[PDB]
A and B are shown apart, each in its own frame.
Chain A
Amino acid sequence: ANVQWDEMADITGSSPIIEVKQDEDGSFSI
C-alpha cells in the first residue's frame, strides 16, 4: 500500500459550493 496513483480508478462525485460552519471542538457544519 504505497503512494501509487491508479488510472483504473472509478470516477464519481458532484462538485457543489458548500457554505460550511467550522468549529474548534469538532469538524464541520452548515
Chain B
Amino acid sequence: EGVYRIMQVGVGIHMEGVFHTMWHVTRGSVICHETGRLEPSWADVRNDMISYGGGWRLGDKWDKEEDVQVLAIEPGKNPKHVQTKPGLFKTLTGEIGAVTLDFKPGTAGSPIINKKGKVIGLYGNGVVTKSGDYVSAITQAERIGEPDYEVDEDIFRKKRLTIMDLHPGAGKTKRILPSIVREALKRRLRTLILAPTRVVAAEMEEALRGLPIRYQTPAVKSEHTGREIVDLMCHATFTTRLLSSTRVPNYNLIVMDEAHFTDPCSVAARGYISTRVEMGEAAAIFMTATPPGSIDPFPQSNSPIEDIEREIPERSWNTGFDWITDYQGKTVWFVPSIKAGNDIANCLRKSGKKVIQLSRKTFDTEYPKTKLTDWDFVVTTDISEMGANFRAGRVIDPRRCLKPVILTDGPERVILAGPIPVTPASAAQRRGRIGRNPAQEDDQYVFSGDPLKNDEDHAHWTEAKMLLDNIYTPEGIIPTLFGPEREKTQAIDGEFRLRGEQRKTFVELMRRGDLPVWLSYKVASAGISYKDREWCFTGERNNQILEENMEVEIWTREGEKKKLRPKWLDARVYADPMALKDFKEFASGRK
C-alpha cells in the first residue's frame, strides 16, 4: 500500500488505510479495487481535498526554506521526481506555498516530498499566469481527522451507564455499534440492541452482517437459545415483553439506539434498563445526539449547514414563498400533524413537485419510497427525528408539533395540544437530517420560531410511569424513571400498579386493542374486561367523537346502532383517519 493511479484523471496516496485525493477529480464516489473499502469520510473545498476511509492522516507542513519535490505519476508515463524551490501564494486567510511545475490535466493528486522523508503536501491544484507559465499551490490538510474509533472498557462494567452522544455524522450505527457488538461477543456477553423503529432495526442488521444477530418480534413474548446470539428488537417490543413475560433474560449488556425517543415505551425502557444497571447486573449504552441533558438546537455536523430563519407556511399558500419551489434540490419538511401534512403536500404538487408523505403508522410502507423513487419533497411528522435518513439538501422546519396532554381539570381526558413549538432536542434532530454528506452546496436548514424547553405536561411521562410500575422484577425493587427524565413527573412510584387480571387486561388493551397507554389504564383500572366494549358508548354528551364533521355511529357486535361516545376521551384514537378506523374496529368488537 503506497501510491496508486485513480481512474487517469487523478492520483492518490494509500496511507493509513484511507485514500487521499481531491474533490474536483472523480467527484465524491467509490474507487473500485479488490476487497473494496472506498467511501467519502471527509471533504473540503477551500482546501480542495476529499480524504476518505478515515478522517485524514497527513502530518507536517513545508515551513518556508525547505526545498520540496513533486512526484509525477502521470497518465501514460512513469513516475518522475522533480525538485523545486517552492514559491508563495498569498491569500486572504494566509500565505501558502505554491510550486511551479509543468504538468498535464489528469496528474492531479500526486504527492510532494518533504526534502527527505514522507509526504508534505498534495499537488494538483493551482492557477495559470497569463504573463508567466505555470503554478500550483502546496495544498495540504491541516489539521488531521479523528481518525478512527476504539471502544472504552468501563462501557462493559456492570453498574455503569454510558451516554454516547455525538451529531449525525458520526458512525454510531455503521462503525461504532458493530465495534461494540464485536467487542461484546469477545467477552461473551448477553447483549441486547434496541432500535426505535423496525426500519432502523433493518439498517442495523445490514450494518451487523456477519454477526449473530437475531431480530425479535413482538408476537413472541420471549425467545431463548443455547447458542450465543445478540437480541435485536424495537424499544416497544422490549417493554411489552417485560409486561407479558416472566422469562426475562438478564442481559449484561444493553445498547439503546436513539435514546432520546420520548415514546412512553422508550422512556419506560430507559427506566427499566437504568434500574438493572443500579442492581449491578448489567452495563448500558444510550446512543443519541441529544441526550435529555442538552438544549442545543444547532448541534455540530460533519458538513456545513446554512441555518436560515424566515417565515414558513403553516397551511396552503398561493403567492410569496417562491424560495420554497424555486429550490431545485430535495427537501424534507416537518409538519405537526397528518392533517397539516396533507394541506401542505397538496399545494406542493400543484407546483409540479413529487411529494411523499410520512407518519407513524405509514412509516414502514412509505419510507422505502424515499429511497427508490426520485422525489422533490418529503412531508413528515416528528417520527423522522429517530434514525430516518434522507438524501436531501434542505430541511424546512416550522418547529411546530402536537403534544398529548392529560387534562386534570374535571373529568380526566387526553387532548392533543398544538401546534406548539418543539423541544430544543427535537429541533436538533429535525435539523440533523442534513449536513451528513459533503456536497458542493452546503445543506440548508430553513426554520421558524424558537423551541420551548418545558414539556413537563407531556402525557408520555405519566404514561411511561404507568408502564413502569406494572413491570415486576426480582424485588424488593421498584423500577423508576431514568435519572434526568425523573423530574418530568410528580407521580409517586408504584401508584399505577395493577394486580392480576387488571394488569393483564391493561396489557391486552394496549397490544391487542391498539389503545393508548392512558386510555388502556383507565379502562383496566376500572375493572372492565377486555372483550367488553360498552364503555365506548356510555360516555358524556361532550364525549361524542366526530369524523369529517359528522357524529360517528357504530354497528355493534350484536347488530345494534350506537353513537361512538367513549367514557374516557383520548384524542389520539380519533386524531387521524387510520387511528379512528382502528378504534371503530375496536368499539365494534371486531378485534
Contact = CB atoms under 8 A, between A and B. Distances in A.
Contacts of B86: 13, 15
Interface stretch (B94-102, B184-192, B545-553): B94-102
A13 B126 CA distance: 14
A9 B87 contact: no
B346 interface: no
Given A13-B100, A27-B127, A2 B88 contact: no
A14 B73 CA distance: 22
16 contacts: A1-B73, A3-B2, A3-B3, A5-B113, A5-B116, A11-B85, A12-B83, A13-B87, A15-B100, A17-B87, A18-B87, A18-B135, A19-B90, A20-B91, A27-B125, A28-B137
Bin chain B's interface residue count: 35 or more
A24 B115 contact: no
B81 interface: yes
B88 A13 contact: no
A8 to B, nearest CB: 8
A22 B47 CA distance: 10
Interface in B56-94: 69, 71, 73, 79, 81-93
A18 B440 contact: no
B331 to A, nearest CB: 22
B118 interface: yes
B45 interface: yes
Question: Is chain A's binding surface mostly helix, strand, loop or mixed?
Answer: loop
Interface of A: 1-6, 8-22, 24-25, 27-30
A10 B190 CA distance: 64
Contacts of A2: 2-3
Question: Is chain B's binding surface mostly helix, strand, loop or mixed?
Answer: loop
Interface of B: 2-4, 13, 15, 24, 45-46, 48, 69, 71, 73, 79, 81-93, 98-101, 111, 113, 115-119, 125-127, 129, 132, 135, 137, 440
A26 to B, nearest CB: 8
A22 B46 contact: yes
Given A3-B2, A10-B82, A30-B127, 4 more contacts: A2-B2, A5-B115, A10-B83, A13-B86
B68 to A, nearest CB: 10
A13 B127 CA distance: 15
B118 A3 contact: yes
A27 B48 contact: yes
> Which 7 interchain pairs have the tightest Cβ spacing?
A6-B81, A13-B84, A9-B81, A1-B3, A2-B2, A15-B87, A28-B127
Nearest to A17: B88
Contacts of B79: 1
Contacts of A29: 127
Contacts of A27: 24, 48, 125-127, 137
Contacts of A20: 89-91, 98, 127, 137
A4 to B, nearest CB: 8
B45 A22 contact: no
A25 B92 contact: no
A13 to B, nearest CB: 4
B276 to A, nearest CB: 51
Nearest to B67: A11
